[PDB]
């Protein structure tokens, strides 16, 4: 009795840069009573969580937020790389209440307009949190979908408790045909993990596309305190960074230089990327009676191994889920922790 | 360093006047009367001030609770 992914078969490519434009759904449907406060409040709360998470794991991307009220798509946060703006925008929205019908077509068109400036190496995306069971379009939709797939704009949507044919067509269409991206939910926890899996970059099997070197430079922190002075918000700020080339102060960020317009990063962002590129082989669960290995943990020192012949208890299993390449044991907690938070396998590091 | 300690009392002026009456009845322990809304007292006798206040309020009102 195990619930594990068999194997990862695109551990070669992902979209590391991103520009994901999450589009919420604020329309009369979202006011029904299936999720604890409503659909809407729970949705926005989880949206905040996802914003934090996504801007953590992909700390070089941008993001924009879009609502769908009264059949209109009203941008509530410009595509920007500072999480706090989007966070505040969502805060503001959550106190406002939905109306009108969701105009999927308008939101789609607004996005396609929005992502034009994003350069070729950056990758586009949208994430429709579609909640209702209808749309209300002021135009042909398949027209838009065709324009989309022409502009190389992958789309993933998370329907609420139903399946809508057009959305299924939409996901199947933009994502190079390979349909896996219209996942819809059946529980709140399912919803949390839905957003979580939306956080990561997105491979399926990438067509051979243009791969391009991108100019960027790293800043150096500043020293003085009273000389507070800023060139990205025109304030007094007690000390920040210096563009190596533009050579002007910039308040703390991985932002783009507001003088000479080149990307700024430290490295730790690149480190996050590295973590996403080449993950580990999924740790194997050791055979119950065939292990005969050390009775402890390895990374930690846990005493949860077996019980040695106990009718049904020992017949159950032997908590020895052990990674492959280092071939050392690890208790369940250690394996969960390694594969979730820190991806340097303890033993596999040491040799 | 100037700090004049004591039992500071603040209430409505009517209750302040009643407290001054009671205090004079019990030999004027009030150290100072800062204003119409504040009083400076020695904390030594404030407890029996409250006791006699309770006694007189029980005498007067008697709490019919009808």
């Amino acid at each position: 009795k195990k619930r594990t992914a068999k194997k990862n078969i695109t551990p070669y490519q992902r979209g590391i840069i991103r520009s994901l434009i999450l589009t919420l759904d604020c329309s009369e449907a979202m006011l029904e009573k299936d999720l604890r406060p409503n659909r809407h409040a729970m949705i926005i709360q989880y949206a905040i969580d996802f914003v934090h998470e996504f801007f953590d794991q992909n700390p070089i991307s941008q993001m924009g937020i879009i609502i769908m009220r009264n059949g209109l798509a009203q941008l509530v946060s410009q595509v920007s790389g500072n999480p706090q703006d989007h966070i505040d925008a969502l805060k503001s929205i959550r106190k406002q209440e939905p109306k009108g019908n969701p105009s999927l077509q308008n939101a789609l068109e607004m996005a396609r307009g929005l992502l034009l400036p994003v350069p070729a190496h950056c990758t586009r995306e949208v994430l429709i949190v579609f909640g209702s069971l209808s749309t209300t379009d002021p135009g042909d939709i398949h027209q838009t979908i065709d324009s989309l797939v022409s502009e190389k704009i992958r789309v993933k949507v998370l329907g609420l408790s139903a399946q809508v044919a057009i959305c299924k067509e939409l996901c199947k269409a933009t994502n190079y045909g390979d349909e896996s991206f219209y996942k819809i939910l059946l529980d709140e926890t399912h919803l949390k993990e839905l957003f979580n899996e939306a956080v990561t970059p997105l491979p399926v099997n990438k067509i051979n596309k243009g791969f391009t070197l991108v100019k960027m430079g790293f800043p150096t922190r500043i020293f003085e305190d009273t000389p507070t002075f800023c060139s990205c918000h025109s304030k007094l700020v007690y000390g920040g960074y210096f563009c190596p080339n533009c050579h002007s102060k910039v308040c703390s960020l991985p932002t783009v230089c507001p003088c000479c317009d080149l990307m700024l990063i430290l490295s730790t962002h690149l480190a996050r990327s590295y973590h996403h590129l080449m993950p580990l082989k999924t740790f194997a669960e050791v055979p119950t009676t065939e292990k005969f290995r050390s009775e402890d943990c390895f990374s930690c020192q846990s005493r949860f191994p077996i019980l040695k012949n106990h009718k049904n208890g020992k017949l159950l299993t032997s908590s020895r889920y052990r990674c492959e390449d280092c071939k050392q044991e690890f208790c369940v907690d250690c394996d969960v922790f390694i594969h979730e938070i820190l991806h340097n396998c303890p033993g596999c590091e040491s040799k | 360093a100037r700090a004049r300690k004591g039992a500071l009392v603040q209430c409505d002026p009517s209750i302040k006047a009643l407290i001054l009456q009671i205090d004079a009845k019990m030999s004027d322990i009030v150290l100072e009367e800062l204003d119409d809304t504040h009083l400076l007292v020695n904390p030594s006798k404030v407890e029996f001030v409250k006791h006699e206040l309770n006694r007189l309020l029980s005498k007067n009102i008697y709490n019919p609770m009808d």
Partner: protein, 348 residues
């Protein structure tokens, strides 16, 4: 209040009183009657007797009853035997009633089918959240020693007439107009009511007021927005309850009838229904300290805890010190109010 809003046409439902002579033994359709007329010592005219004779003549297939617990079941059983009806109905109000005698009115009429589950009713949206509050206004040393020297009713005239009560009333009046909420004040005293209704410029409905002036204020309250603070005695609350005004202020309160004030205050909150998102129905009570009325007002709030309504205490709202329009705030006006109250105690 309802039967014309309801489908009922009162053309057939002749109302009999033994004083409100109406068409008996000729009503083509259903009738509406009362226990006092149907069977009681209040058979002032033989109209009630003729109504009962007609009731015997026609086998009334059904009977509608409202609050029979108050009327003893003896008259009910007498008319049950007299009329020999086909069916009846009991629209009860209390789980236990004085008419639970050996012959229960249930088996006289029928079994129970529904219970007025007030926890199911009083929480889904009608009352709009009762917020029971009591403004603890201060009192004065000149009225307290004159309060203790008076007893046997002529002592409530010093309690109600307080200078800080006008500072708490004109502050809550100006506070509710800034939020756009109408005010429906209540009271008990007759005189003390006209003195607080004439100075604030708030039309009044009181005892023995002509109905041509009574309905004109209701046309200036339900249509005109300039009258958001009305002053009603005991006639304008037991006759018509207004579903507006989400802010209620109680000033004059009588002892004993604290449950009758609870029946009056409950009928206003039940009339105010529209299921709003906020719908905050504020209730205030200007109770002066160390007076015999605030200790009886705690029995009134104790009945509201029995209904499930939440009660909070508000000593003073931080805003009454910034209102220059509060009458009797200056000590000169407090001494002028003292002389007006000392003349009122000399007249009563």
């Amino acid at each position: 209040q309802f039967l014309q809003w309801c489908t009922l046409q009162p053309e057939n439902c002749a109302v009999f009183t033994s004083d409100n002579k109406e068409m008996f033994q000729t009503e083509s359709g259903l009738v509406v009657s009362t226990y006092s007329m149907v069977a009681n010592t209040r058979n002032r005219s033989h109209d009630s007797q003729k109504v009962m004779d007609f009731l015997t003549g026609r086998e009334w297939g059904f009977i509608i009853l409202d609050e029979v617990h108050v009327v003893p079941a003896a008259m009910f059983r007498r008319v049950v035997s007299t009329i020999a009806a086909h069916a009846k109905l009991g629209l009860t109000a209390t789980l236990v009633r004085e008419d639970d005698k050996i012959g229960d009115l249930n088996f006289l009429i029928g079994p129970k089918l529904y219970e007025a589950n007030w926890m199911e009713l009083s929480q889904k949206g009608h009352i709009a959240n009762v917020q029971c509050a009591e403004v603890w206004c201060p009192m004065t040393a000149e009225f307290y020693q004159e309060y203790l020297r008076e007893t046997a009713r002529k002592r409530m005239l010093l309690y109600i007439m307080n200078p800080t009560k006008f500072q708490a009333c004109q502050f809550l009046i100006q506070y509710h107009e800034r939020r756009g909420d109408k005010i429906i004040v209540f009271s008990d005293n007759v005189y003390a009511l006209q003195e607080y209704a004439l100075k604030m410029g708030k039309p009044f409905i009181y005892g023995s007021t002509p109905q041509q002036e009574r309905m004109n204020i209701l046309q200036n309250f339900q249509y005109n927005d300039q009258i958001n603070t009305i002053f009603l005695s005991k006639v304008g609350d037991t006759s018509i309850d207004l579903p507006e005004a989400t802010c209620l202020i109680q000033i004059s309160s009588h002892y004993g009838s604290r449950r009758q004030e609870a029946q009056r205050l409950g009928r206003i909150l039940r009339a105010k229904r529209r299921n709003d998102e906020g719908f905050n129905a504020f209730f205030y009570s200007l109770v002066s300290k160390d007076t015999q009325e605030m200790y009886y007002s705690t029995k009134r709030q104790a009945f509201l805890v029995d209904q499930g309504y939440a009660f909070k205490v508000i000593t003073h709202l931080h805003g009454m010190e910034n209102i220059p329009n509060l009458a009797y705030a200056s000590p000169r006006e407090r001494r002028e109010l003292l002389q007006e109250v000392l003349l009122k105690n000399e007249e009563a």
